RNA sequence: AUUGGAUAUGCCAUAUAAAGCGCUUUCGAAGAGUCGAGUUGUUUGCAGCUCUAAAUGGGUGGUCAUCUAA
RNA sequence: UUGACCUCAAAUCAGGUAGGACUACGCGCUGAACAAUAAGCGCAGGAAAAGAAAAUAACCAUGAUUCCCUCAGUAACGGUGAAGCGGGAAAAGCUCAAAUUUGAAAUCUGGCAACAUUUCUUUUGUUGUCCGAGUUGUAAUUUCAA
């Protein structure tokens, strides 16, 4: 049982081509969703900062975005992560606020029945 | 309302009510064929909570397997092979005695338009689910092959991945 | 202080009692539903009020024969 | 009589934890010297440029 | 005072400071530990500085709780909460109350999301300060204790020692209203009527004396709303001291009853606590008072007692009180049995039913919150009979 | 892209809804009987409040009937 | 400019927040209704044959063997302790009612 | 020619309706021959047999943390 | 009695569906040599399986699964031989059972009638009516993140 990496330049170009069709389908929105900033859970890397999965419910409510719409404007949700330190709430709320600063939202046509 | 009460009456399987029923039901089931249709589930609340809904296309078959591979996992392979067209949803214990285990197996008709048009049970019409009792993709199949999240739950070892630049 | 006394049953050396109603002997004086009563059980049904509206839909557009049309038909 | 065998298990963890921080510090300390230890401009090399 | 606070005080008509408030409110603005007579406008005395204090720090639901006010009983906690909601209607701070006998699963999630101003019973406060998670009570800026003598007489000895230890006393002023030890750490008429016929008898009594001035005292503000709604709904127009829980309406209704030579009014013990009793022909206490020694002092027309046949220990209490007494008999044949129509209307109607259960729940909680357990015991009283009085053939399922 | 977002929102500006005939006469029957301020009291009545609306939704109908 | 800046650190200043309650942690609370449902079914289904013999031992007052029998049948003391307390609750209730 | 997701615009809308956030003096159901134990095979789990449960419980980790199976 | 309801059957009763083939990849059962190994048997797809924690961890804590790189030939075992961590690819979340719609089974297959519709006279629907399914529970509702 042996594996060869001859398709390594083939697979990389397939991935790039897979990104370009995604960009074609969804033009204005970025090819990647926003991710939060979290700290690795170990004494070795705890002083580091990296990306998370999504923004917890305290990070959404504090920033001012409901949890239902957040999934629609590209902000992802992590029901499992929680905020134990306020610096973790702060680094990710401002991460949301800077995102909503640059976020153009296209209006959608809405059904308007004659009566009500 | 009722399936709360039926939940805790089925939790005591050696009490007099159940043991008196275990003898009465096992005697009459052995009188029947090995695999036979059942109109209403012998355990309505268990069939309910396992996915069964009282509507057309939902079927139930009762099977006895000799004691002495899993017994319940067997009941699913034998029922499905009997009803070749139905997709097996689930299975549950109904009764047992000294020489047999009686199992009920729920099946779905992939062709019935009450099922095919049901937004929630549509997933079973897809061919990838052909005979899930045969591949080990049911609940007991998932358990009997040790699939799950945990620390208590091959070729990645033997392989020799030689990268392009090595 | 156990005195190291050994039980006499150590491994190292009516079938039909009457129905005992110990729980239902006394009648409960309150219900179990602690939840407040909703509005549905006191307001006209919204199930038919929805069905009525789409019946008016079918009447207005001529989808279904009317009651007076049914009698003459 | 010493700690525990799994308490010496953490002895690597108090040995390995200060690896990543040491390595990151070595990266910036090397770069800081690089800014310091650079050759001056040689003002005679802009005659033609 | 702030602009927001000044405008709200006009809604209830609260403009002139009380005699106690004259030397308290001006001093309480400095935020110093300051340690009144019955019904003397105290409610605003320890509330005006607190709401101003919250606005000074610009409190938010994020900032936890800053002010905690402690009440001897449930009913008093209701009175302060009612005033707090009216004067904070023009502010962005959060007003809340946690009390004994309430939904502590709904008394907790409210605190988790952020509560700044809180009025609480010592029993429920101790539970939250020790067992509730997510409640941010490290940032207390004000602590208020009202009627310490009543608090100590209830049986809150170990509660004050435990609770006040938890409260961070640094950077905080304390308002106090054995007491020094706590500050060191800083004629009668009665009718023997059964519970089931209690409501029926009073309805007949109001029917007979419709052309006389009658006032009835009950143990719940929720009961006041229910009976007033019920009586006005059976073609018995009755004034009450609840309205829409508006203090201005209560003052207007009380004032209107004063000039009116005839009428029937409903209010609680704390509702009339401190108010001047006008010339009234008939005064009645429907439920047993929570302050028996204040009941004898308040009376000192003609007085009436509505007592159950199993709570006659209060009559013996009058012997120990050296107060003369007399009994009034009633033949049950002439008591109107409108009970057949009453419960039928309750089941038919929605809002009337909801008032009854809330009044019923408040009646049982207030009874369970009594002090004289050797006189009034919840276990001795039959719950089925009490539920019949409220208009329920069967008791509603209230958690204790 | 941003300019089109403003214009698309400009077209979709009329978010206020009118009233149909049923709720129209529904609100007049309540208004002319229980004034125009005690919305809680008018939600407490059941003889005219057939659907048993709450105070919050009655106020919404009152605002919507204006325009 | 929305941009993640990873590496080094972001901040050493710490402030713990008293975490709320998650409703999945609430599992295992005794619902008031279901206690009644479990009790009523316990009365109806009767008692297990081995569990019936435990009652007689308690009535005969050989509690030591009652623990031994339940422990043997169930598997651990805490499982046996709860059953014994469950059984003795039945016995006292039947004796006061009957 | 055959289709796909969008835009533009015409018509029809059964809306007396349906949602999100908010506040709660009212509530909050949670998967059994399963988990678990003894014991025997298979290769730690899985399987048979013997018994067989609980309701701040139950599993797992370090009096705590995390998780919420059938 | 009638006749309901339950079971029992039959019919060239209508509408269906299953089998065998392929097997590189894939999911199971099972298996000796020389090792979950060949084989044997069973079941599938354009991928299959897995999957939104009864998951780690002891941290400033992380956050469905899958694959890659490292962790590492390390721990552990006694040569066999990993997993968190970290870094990348990709990302998306959800539906039931347990609630009385109870002021109204609101749900659905099938026959028939017209209306349509098409990769299509070869497809797939709607409306109306009738009959069944269903109250031993089909819709809405709610899934712990609540």
Curated annotation (Swiss-Prot), chain B:
Transmembrane segments: none annotated. Residues 134-153 are annotated as: Disordered. Belongs to the eukaryotic ribosomal protein eL15 family. GO terms for biological process: cytoplasmic translation. The keyword Nucleotidyltransferase does not apply. GO terms for cellular component: cytosolic large ribosomal subunit; nucleolus; nucleus; preribosome. Keywords: Cytoplasm, Nucleus, Ribonucleoprotein, Ribosomal protein. The gene is rpl15. The keyword Cytoplasm applies. Residues 142-152 have a biased composition (Basic residues). GO terms for molecular function: RNA binding; structural constituent of ribosome. PANTHER family: LARGE RIBOSOMAL SUBUNIT PROTEIN EL15 (PTHR11847:SF4), RIBOSOMAL PROTEIN L15 (PTHR11847). There are 2 genes for eL15 in S.pombe. Coiled coil: none annotated. It is found in: Cytoplasm; Nucleus; Nucleus, Nucleolus. Component of the ribosome, a large ribonucleoprotein complex responsible for the synthesis of proteins in the cell. The small ribosomal subunit (SSU) binds messenger RNAs (mRNAs) and translates the encoded message by selecting cognate aminoacyl-transfer RNA (tRNA) molecules. The large subunit (LSU) contains the ribosomal catalytic site termed the peptidyl transferase center (PTC), which catalyzes the formation of peptide bonds, thereby polymerizing the amino acids delivered by tRNAs into a polypeptide chain. This is Large ribosomal subunit protein eL15A.
Swiss-Prot record, chain C:
Belongs to the WD repeat BOP1/ERB1 family. It is found in: Nucleus, Nucleolus; Nucleus, Nucleoplasm. It comes from Schizosaccharomyces pombe (strain 972 / ATCC 24843) (Fission yeast). Component of the NOP7 complex, composed of erb1, ppp1/nop7 and ytm1/SPAC890.04c. The complex is held together by erb1, which interacts with ppp1/nop7 via its N-terminal domain and with ytm1/SPAC890.04c via a high-affinity interaction between the seven-bladed beta-propeller domains of the 2 proteins. The NOP7 complex associates with the 66S pre-ribosome. This is Ribosome biogenesis protein erb1. It comes from the Eukaryota. Disulfide bonds: none annotated. Component of the NOP7 complex, which is required for maturation of the 25S and 5.8S ribosomal RNAs and formation of the 60S ribosome.
Swiss-Prot record, chain F:
It is found in: Nucleus, Nucleolus. Component of the pre-66S ribosomal particle. Involved in the biogenesis of the 60S ribosomal subunit. Belongs to the NOP16 family. This is Nucleolar protein 16. It comes from Schizosaccharomyces pombe (strain 972 / ATCC 24843). The lineage of its organism: Eukaryota, Fungi, Dikarya, Ascomycota, Taphrinomycotina. The gene is nop16. The chain holds residues 141 to 207 of 209 of the full protein.
Swiss-Prot record, chain G:
There are 2 genes for eL36 in S.pombe. The gene is rpl3602. The keyword Membrane does not apply. It holds the Pfam family Ribosomal_L36e. It is found in: Cytoplasm. Component of the large ribosomal subunit (LSU). Mature yeast ribosomes consist of a small (40S) and a large (60S) subunit. The 40S small subunit contains 1 molecule of ribosomal RNA (18S rRNA) and at least 33 different proteins. The large 60S subunit contains 3 rRNA molecules (25S, 5.8S and 5S rRNA) and at least 46 different proteins. GO terms for biological process: cytoplasmic translation. GO terms for cellular component: cytosol; cytosolic large ribosomal subunit; preribosome. This is Large ribosomal subunit protein eL36B. Keywords: Cytoplasm, Ribonucleoprotein, Ribosomal protein. It comes from Schizosaccharomyces pombe (strain 972 / ATCC 24843) (Fission yeast). Its main location: cytoplasm. Residues 1-31 are annotated as: Disordered. Gene3D superfamilies: 60S ribosomal protein L36. One of its GO terms (molecular function) is structural constituent of ribosome. Belongs to the eukaryotic ribosomal protein eL36 family.
